[PDB]
């Protein structure tokens, strides 16, 4: 599982592999680890039991309105219960949420991670690899936020033995 | 090239004097010598560098044919030029694939 | 325990071994790991304490009506509580549910697994093996959804030292 | 890694993937795991640890050169070296070797084992998978030997995360 | 594996299953675990690790050839080699050997042990099972020796997941 | 540590960080992990344990001096020493060596491995990171070889806590 | 993560690195581990899931008023529930709180730590190092409470492979 | 134990605590961990296990006597003995040695390492502490070398429970 | 076991309990753990494992006989044998030896250590206890040496479950 979120020149893209795996065997490869939410306004990928995701991206929907759309808030508030609630600590995963202005990574254990002066996010076992490729690209090439994620995932999958080729990207809007 | 002709009793000086026993007259051509030498240096580099003894190889791997049939050539003279040399020394032997050990 | 669900040319079949085992000894071999439900409309096999199964295939019956028969839903909703409820996380098993349209595998830990362009499902320790045989067969042979599962299980059992011969198949309808 | 071999109608095929996995990452996708021995008249395929597999292979090679290539013999000889009295390094790997005569797998612990009857052999982490596949195919399809192998490996790779798609199938006219 | 031997009315039977289990999978169902020694006048059956069992067997074979086949002696001799001073490899396996004279099991750690009185011996993971069976039968049925063995193994196989049904019963006229 | 090497357009670059990490602390930030061999015509870079890396390097050095510097050969030779019969110390480290001819990494367990095609090699804890970076760059930018390397290492260091910024890039005219 | 609080000649300073880390990889380096609270009257840094922090620095705000601003109290009272509450023991971290008069370190496990006749505090993995530098400095040099923390953190980061350069200091007022 | 050495203005100081800790108790508080070698012209300080530290020291002593006391050389020589081919005992300890020429620490695993530039070296459990202290001081105070050392050790002892106050500071006119 | 020795006013006393503890049971309460050496002019007391303690003692005995009984020397010699090059058995035990000259404890790992100044030494599981006692007494009571020892052991035995009351106090006129 490798998820990566790029942001360059007006475009906010998030996309990743689709390889569910049990130990050292493949269980599904067509999966979607990137989904849209909040009336197709906020797109976000995951890395864990896809269910754990929904039960989270659902607690995010609600916990987003209350604070009036302000993304970061909805998040900071989310990691505030993910650790205090004894029915969430059991939902280990990683999360990436992004919209028009910024982008953010949510954590079940630690706490929210705001991007660098490069605006790039990555999670999953194959993460950093993807990140390693992306960063580079958005530093020398003039590629598309969607021409980078693209290539970046390729670079991941071809290394992490848990990340593959069938990725699903989601530009905006 | 130099060891090949210059010294006293150089390789060429020797094979020449020997064939002269069967009643044969051989003549080494500069251009040939040059090749014999390029040859030696080659294999020494490409395989196991044994110094100058290598000339004693390329030399014998070349003079094989004449060395044998030279008895039945009394009277003739033989000219060892490039085209000759080039044809007594194949090019490279054995697949020499050192890959069967690599991953 | 090996369960496999095939789908080919109008037929939806599910069948598997019947070897309950305690550590490295056999405790029962005539068992039924494939059962019919919802008024004989939905058939489904399991892989775990058969009880854990019923207490699950019972929570599925109800959680299926609410969403109006739509199989996938009843499932996605099921794995939604299997992880949030502290009285279900203790029910470790694997599940396969299928009906007229599609077929699906349920997970206690991860999340629902939708088949490939081949429509094949498999769980249990001997799973993949069965899967390995099936897939192949439904790719070259013109065998029956019931002539495949058949042979597939044979191929499993003869390898997994926990899967045997007394399988129970369930075609539809 | 996955290495399987099938033998039918004067044909002997031994082929395998090409993935070298360091921990949970990929060293190199292209790797020749099946190779030719004895002037190219006996087929070989090694599994396990790169180091110990290669050192197993080489040792089997010396034996052949020392026994007019007579496979079976050569094997039992090598095996003997582990059964003598001074426990050799005990290489952790496995080899599948065969030629015009017979097929045979050899562990680096000290034994030579023969195929059931379906003349199907398969070592590696993906073996059993490719096995099942072939064990199936063979029983239900007049597919060639150089064909079953090709498809069985693939079936595996799509299952074992340590088994890729860059195969190498050495057959024996 | 299961290897049991019963001795009654001038008859000595030593038979066992034929399953080679690699981890929790099956290498080969047909395997001769009981064999003949000394021109074919002394029966043998090995258990444990394929490698170490075979290397145990072979060592017992040299002794016989060196002691006019006199079983008992041959055994104590071999045993001695472990009791000398330089701890030999210490093979992890077990052998059940017998002939017209007596029955005897030998561990690869250094000892020779004799049967209670019912002249019943059984090693392997299924042993005790087959044991119980025979230990019973014998006490309550004039069943032959070549008969008790046959049924006892089977009783085991239906219990030990590492013990199959393809037996091999070598008796001694 | 991170050691990566890229080869393109007659250029061969092998460079790495300079951090020596004792447990979770820093011994020294400046360290030359890439050095020159054979009168300075073949490049080297070692990874792993300071002790075993150095002792690996030295052993590769003797071979060169003994084989007219012919890299490839020299390697397979050294590798051989581990495959002989008496298992050598088995140094836990890795070396990336190259010259005007080819690139090649050598483990201290006994093997020599070659690059995919992108002529990209990278060992160390940060390797894969620098790898991804370069594996990317190369595929999308006419950046020099002595340039890709420089940027890839950096990308790593900003990711691997055991990889710093004090690089050393030895190229080969 | 390294946090250090100094107090010298009328100034109360607290500042630390900004390196969030997952195992042995960097996840964020621009983070703020020092924050102001209680109407910018009390500043305090942390060392743990930044969230865990807020959910703590929030329970401190309230638990501070009740006792009428008296810092130490608000703290002693805080560690009184951090251990009795089964929803706080799950919030492992370290904390430093300081204001006009004194400065204090809070603990999730142990209990409040009052400074020495030097008025210096330190937490995080790189702590003591920072402390080691600070103490020294505030014992010989006449540096600023802000010229010390400064240099002290530098000294930490350059040793702890989890502490870096992007620190955020907070003097008062 | 803590052993630190600083070198500035023709002065070389190597001093350390004196505590011998058996498990969590104290063997003896007074212990000379820094001593003189080669007629008393080269300084030494050992860390780690009493046994292996002493046996490391002694071995470094033989080398000196054998190489006109030329430090650096002597070191690399000793180091070599571990890199040869027959892995020596591998003493678990560390030595900090220096004289009028240079400073150098030597592990008992097989390496010699040099100081950054601040000519500061420190081994032992308290090392890094004393390090930080000195690494600081030096950068901000014209304190002597025989002075920094004295204060740095102390700073450590007040931190490391295995480092006491009975120092021994051997300097080199 | 507890073995303590005190030295004051020309008197040297070394005495200890007599309990041999096998696991958590008692082998024999009466055991002489302190004995006489060199014609009976040097005192000895061993701790640790019966086997290794005795084998340590004996080795110290050979040395004495070989060095005109000169204690100190004899010790350093023995110690040397562990520091040579071929790591000896490494006995897990400890000895407290003394005579008219000095006191000295010797570990079986390779070192000789001297008393603080209070000339108090104590090894064994109860040592530190008896130590504390004596370390006290001595500092506050003109109690004899053959007296402090007697009371200190007892204080221990009433604390260490592996230290009984059947003492043996060998003094040295
Ligand atoms: Mg992959
Ligand atoms: Mg089975
Ligand atoms: Mg795969
Ligand atoms: Mg069975
Ligand atoms: Mg770093
Ligand atoms: Mg750091
Ligand atoms: Mg202390
Ligand atoms: Mg007691």
Swiss-Prot record, chains A, C, D, E, F, G, H, I:
EC number: 3.4.25.2
One annotated GO molecular function: metal ion binding
Keywords, comma-separated and alphabetical: Allosteric enzyme, Cytoplasm, Hydrolase, Metal-binding, Protease, Sodium, Threonine protease
Compartments where located: Cytoplasm
Active site: 1
Catalytic activity: ATP-dependent cleavage of peptide bonds with broad specificity
GO biological process: proteolysis involved in protein catabolic process
Activity regulation statement: Allosterically activated by HslU binding.
Residues engaged in binding Na(+): 157, 160, 163
Oligomer status and interactors: A double ring-shaped homohexamer of HslV is capped on each side by a ring-shaped HslU homohexamer. The assembly of the HslU/HslV complex is dependent on binding of ATP.
Protein name per the record: ATP-dependent protease subunit HslV
Species, as recorded: Haemophilus influenzae (strain ATCC 51907 / DSM 11121 / KW20 / Rd)
Higher taxonomy: Bacteria, Pseudomonadati, Pseudomonadota, Gammaproteobacteria, Pasteurellales
Swiss-Prot record, chain B:
Known function: ATPase subunit of a proteasome-like degradation complex; this subunit has chaperone activity. The binding of ATP and its subsequent hydrolysis by HslU are essential for unfolding of protein substrates subsequently hydrolyzed by HslV. HslU recognizes the N-terminal part of its protein substrates and unfolds these before they are guided to HslV for hydrolysis.
UniProt-annotated binding residues for ATP: 53
Family, per entry: Belongs to the ClpX chaperone family. HslU subfamily.
Included range, full protein: 342 to 444 of 444
Oligomeric and partner information: A double ring-shaped homohexamer of HslV is capped on each side by a ring-shaped HslU homohexamer. The assembly of the HslU/HslV complex is dependent on binding of ATP.
Cellular localisation: Cytoplasm
Source organism (scientific name): Haemophilus influenzae (strain ATCC 51907 / DSM 11121 / KW20 / Rd)
Organism lineage: Bacteria, Pseudomonadati, Pseudomonadota, Gammaproteobacteria, Pasteurellales
Protein name: ATP-dependent protease ATPase subunit HslU
The gene coding this protein: hslU
